[PDB]
Design a protein around this ligand. Structure first.
Ligand SMILES: [Cl-]
Ligand SMILES: [Cl-]
Ligand SMILES: [Cl-]
Ligand SMILES: [Cl-]
Ligand SMILES: [K+]
Ligand SMILES: [Mg+2]
Ligand SMILES: [Mg+2]
Ligand SMILES: [Mg+2]
Ligand SMILES: [Mg+2]
Ligand SMILES: [Mg+2]
Ligand SMILES: [Mg+2]
Ligand SMILES: [Mg+2]
Ligand SMILES: [Mg+2]
Ligand SMILES: [Mg+2]
Ligand SMILES: [Mg+2]
Ligand SMILES: [Mg+2]
Ligand SMILES: [Mg+2]
Ligand SMILES: [Mg+2]
Ligand SMILES: [Mg+2]
Ligand SMILES: [Mg+2]
Ligand SMILES: [Mg+2]
Ligand SMILES: [Mg+2]
Ligand SMILES: [Mg+2]
Ligand SMILES: [Mg+2]
Ligand SMILES: [Mg+2]
Ligand code: NA
Ligand code: NA
Ligand code: NA
Ligand code: NA
Ligand code: NA
Ligand code: NA
Ligand code: NA
Ligand code: NA
Ligand code: NA
Ligand code: NA
Lengths: 92, 237, 56, 194
RNA sequence: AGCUUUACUGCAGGCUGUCGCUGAGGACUCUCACUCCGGGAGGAGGACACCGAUAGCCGGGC
RNA sequence: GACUCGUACGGUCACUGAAUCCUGCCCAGUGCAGGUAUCUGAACACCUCGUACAAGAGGACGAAGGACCUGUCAACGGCGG
RNA sequence: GAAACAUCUCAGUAUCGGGAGGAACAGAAAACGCAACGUGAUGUCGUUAGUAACCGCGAGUGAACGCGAUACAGCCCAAAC
């Protein structure tokens, strides 16, 4: 489906309808310093490493909508439940 | 599975050892103090169990009795010489340098004074080709060109007993008798005729290797069998 | 040739004998070692914890 | 003023610099050709020896002991083991090479007892430590106040029971507080968890 | 349970880079450690190899 | 430490199985081996970011291995519609 | 055991090597950290507590300081001179 790059809607921050802008969420980069990271290095030794010896799973036929909603005025974003969509194209 | 036969060897059990105690003498050149003086006469010609070839029993001036790797044409009474300036006849032993080129040589040394390592089996002969102040190129029997220290002693002539390989063993019995005088387990059962547990080629409902016979050099012992690091195979091509 | 009865008949070789050290007939005269007290193998006497229940 | 000793000591702060460097490059050679346990008449590090309890007296012996460098010399499993327990290469022993040395030495001198030991260098494949031993039966020692204690029966075979200093240290008994819950008063009494 | 393999996961083993042993003047000379040969004088080899540590690849040999 | 008191006319590793007449075609896959502009390829050291240090992020360099290329079937095997 | 199983668990258990004593080991703070104007070597017993902490954050695993008791006990070198 196609979707407007900008449109009006409620801004949970301002508490009033403003023109928001939609962007597909870009994955942040990791620091490899979280607690989970430490445990990996800490609990991995000789032989099988339990959980840390597993590999990434598979994928669902279609992914959900992973968007960010930016408020034209205050400039703060907010998230929304997503919906399965083979592809998502923005309009303008 | 179980260790393959190739692994049972390494352990050095009776079945794999050579009947050392039944061997005669460790053939090695002499520690001629120097000068080349040393010389001696041939006494008897004995059979060397370890090599299926003859060995000349020798007695020297200092009265030291020792058996020596005997080249072809060497009889009782003959007078052998060993040193830096011995003659240039078959039998005498001297550093490569003092040896004229194009001359068939046997029982060659790798490290000067090591007693001899190269060319020393029924009929084989080495070949001194190039001379130098440093290098003494010797074409070994395998064909390779071994670059050697001119100080490495060697013997003139071809090893005795040449042509042994010409007559076939004909019957197992003969092979048997020969094998019994060597450090080897014989007869030989083919892997392909063994059970899986016993050899990487074992198993099947019919005899044939499981995977391809050519194996990597990195294969571990227990799995290195068949055609080891073969650069190619077959007669064809 | 059965491995049973018929092979019992060749057993006339002496191995274990009265032990000079512990008095048991466990001194292997061909090995010169007692399988009971360890005489001939060790100065300390042969003894293992598995010769009795763990908590005893 | 700085004791003469203080120099011997300060020199070993960096066994790889100056005179002590060349000295080592030289000794190790005569060393790599000596045995496993070599009694020597005088300590290579007088400051340390004296410090640890040495004393040019009778009944006091010294010996240099070499021990192979590296991890445990372990044999792979010949029976079923879960992955965790199939290791060989990275397994290390829980007794430091120094303690290994104190024992090899003490066994060479059955009548003596280990007083202390210190390191004296290491080439590419081995480590040398000098061990101070004591004749608990010599009257020269039975009468020396700063040492007669080591004559007590309860001091017998002290190195094999970890009473040596390097032993108590290797036993996690350094700290008296946090961290030593499973070490004091004994490893075995704490069900071997330290 | 035995057995197999391009099943899962690992562990030996082999090859390879790196660090320590290890020194003098990206290719190069050298000798003094270390190695081998020689009974020895001495020779060859030489900061490599060996060995200790680590990393990547191979790895039903287990 | 065995082989080895041995040294390629040796001995190790495999296949076939006396003699006789013979043993074709196939290197795409798998295996082994050789080469290799370029690509890919870890760690230490090195550079940048970062942090009064550190964790950590990135880069340059690049070994064996691989991609790619060649050789090889008395190598595993194949020899149809 | 985890209702499979690899980390985990069984367990630092079974078993093995070495060694002391009548008891061993520990022990006079580079401690604690109820954070204090506070405690004062060490074992042990009761409790703290199935708490904090660990863990395919699954199953399971699991202290310490302090407190009340028992018994108490403090010293010797190296070096400077
Ligand atoms: Cl999206
Ligand atoms: Cl033969
Ligand atoms: Cl002791
Ligand atoms: Cl308090
Ligand atoms: K288990
Ligand atoms: Mg791991
Ligand atoms: Mg035999
Ligand atoms: Mg020989
Ligand atoms: Mg033949
Ligand atoms: Mg056969
Ligand atoms: Mg069969
Ligand atoms: Mg198999
Ligand atoms: Mg057949
Ligand atoms: Mg076949
Ligand atoms: Mg039977
Ligand atoms: Mg005093
Ligand atoms: Mg206790
Ligand atoms: Mg089963
Ligand atoms: Mg040698
Ligand atoms: Mg298996
Ligand atoms: Mg047949
Ligand atoms: Mg279960
Ligand atoms: Mg579960
Ligand atoms: Mg536990
Ligand atoms: Mg505490
Ligand atoms: Na940990
Ligand atoms: Na087979
Ligand atoms: Na002792
Ligand atoms: Na611990
Ligand atoms: Na079975
Ligand atoms: Na092919
Ligand atoms: Na091919
Ligand atoms: Na179950
Ligand atoms: Na099961
Ligand atoms: Na776990």
């Amino acid at each position: 489906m196609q979707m407007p790059r900008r449109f009006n809607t409620y801004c949970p921050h301002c508490n009033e309808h403003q023109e928001h802008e939609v962007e597909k969420v870009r994955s942040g980069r990791q620091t490899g310093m979280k607690w989970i990271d430490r445990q990996r290095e800490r609990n991995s030794g000789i032989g099988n490493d339990g959980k840390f010896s597993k590999v990434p799973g598979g994928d669902k036929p279609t992914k959900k909508t992973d968007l960010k909603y930016r408020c034209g005025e205050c400039g703060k974003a907010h998230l929304r439940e997503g919906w399965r969509a083979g592809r998502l194209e923005f309009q303008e | 599975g179980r260790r393959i036969q190739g692994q049972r060897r390494g352990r050095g059990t009776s079945t794999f050892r050579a009947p050392s105690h039944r061997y005669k003498a460790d053939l090695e050149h002499r520690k001629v103090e120097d000068g080349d003086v040393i010389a001696g006469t041939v006494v008897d010609i004995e059979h060397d169990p370890a090599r299926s070839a003859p060995v000349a029993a020798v007695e020297f001036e200092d009265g030291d009795r020792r058996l020596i790797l005997a080249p072809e044409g060497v009889g009782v009474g003959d007078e052998l010489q060993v040193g830096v300036s011995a003659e240039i006849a078959p039998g005498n032993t001297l550093p490569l340098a003092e040896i004229p080129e194009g001359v068939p040589v046997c029982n060659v040394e790798s490290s000067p004074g090591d007693g001899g390592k190269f060319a020393r089996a029924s009929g084989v002969n080495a070949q001194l080709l190039t001379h130098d102040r440093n290098v003494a190129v010797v074409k070994l029997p395998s064909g390779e060109m071994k670059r050697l220290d001119p100080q490495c002693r060697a013997t003139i002539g071809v090893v005795a007993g040449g042509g042994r390989t010409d007559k076939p063993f004909v019957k197992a019995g003969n092979k048997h008798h020969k094998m019994k005088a060597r450090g080897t387990k014989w007869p030989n059962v083919r892997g392909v005729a063994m059970n899986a547990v016993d050899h990487p080629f074992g198993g099947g409902g019919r005899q044939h290797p499981g995977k391809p016979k050519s194996i990597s050099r990195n294969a571990p012992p227990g799995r290195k069998v068949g055609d080891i690091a073969s650069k190619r195979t077959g007669r064809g091509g | 040739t059965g491995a049973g009865t018929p092979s019992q008949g060749k057993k006339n070789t002496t191995t274990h004998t009265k032990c000079r050290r512990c008095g048991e007939k466990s001194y292997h005269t061909k090995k010169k070692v007692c399988s009971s007290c360890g005489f001939g193998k060790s100065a300390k006497r042969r003894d293992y914890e598995w010769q009795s229940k763990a908590g005893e | 003023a700085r004791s003469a000793y203080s120099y011997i000591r300060d020199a070993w702060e960096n066994p790889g610099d100056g005179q002590l460097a060349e000295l080592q490059w030289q000794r190790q050679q005569e060393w790599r050709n000596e045995g496993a346990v070599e009694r020597i008449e005088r300590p290579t590090r007088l400051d340390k020896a004296r410090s640890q309890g040495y004393k040019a007296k009778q009944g006091v012996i010294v010996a240099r002991v070499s021990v192979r460098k590296g991890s445990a010399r372990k044999r792979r499993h010949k029976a079923g083991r879960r992955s965790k327990r199939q290791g060989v290469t990275r397994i290390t022993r829980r007794k430091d090479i120094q303690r290994v040395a104190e024992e090899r030495a003490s066994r060479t001198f059955p009548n003596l007892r280990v007083l202390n030991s210190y390191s004296v260098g290491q080439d590419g494949r081995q480590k040398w430590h000098e061990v101070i031993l004591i004749d608990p039966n010599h009257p020269a020692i039975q009468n020396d106040d700063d040492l007669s204690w080591i004559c007590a029966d309860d001091q017998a075979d002290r190195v094999f029971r970890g009473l040596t200093g390097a032993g108590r240290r290797n036993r996690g008994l350094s700290g008296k507080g946090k961290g030593s819950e499973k070490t004091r008063p004994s490893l075995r009494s704490n069900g071997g968890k330290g």
